[PDB]
């Protein structure tokens, strides 16, 4: 199961406490050992 918790709170990171709630529940079966990220470039 691949779990994701998330929260979007409006305002180097600051200092405080905020608990994150479940977002999805995904019965995938997938194994993970590595990952990457994706960014939106500047072109115009």
């Amino acid at each position: 199961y691949f779990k994701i918790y998330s929260k979007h709170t409006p305002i180097d990171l600051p200092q405080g406490f905020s608990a994150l709630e479940p977002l999805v529940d995904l019965p995938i079966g997938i194994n993970i050992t590595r990952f990457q990220t994706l960014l939106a470039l500047h072109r115009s």
Binding site: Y1, P27, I28, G29
Partner: protein, 49 residues
């Protein structure tokens, strides 16, 4: 590859039949398709199971 020459004035046993074979398997994924769970009414203020 030969062809079936289906005409309506054939005999049963030479007429076309549509077949749908189903196949179930449970490889390793710990959830997927399963049928419906029925739910009855609901009472209140009673000791119930």
């Amino acid at each position: 590859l030969q062809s079936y020459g289906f005409r309506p004035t054939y005999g049963v046993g030479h007429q076309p039949y549509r077949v749908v074979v189903l196949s179930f398997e449970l490889l390793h994924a710990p959830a997927t398709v399963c049928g419906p769970k029925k739910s009855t009414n609901l009472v209140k203020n009673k000791c119930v199971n």
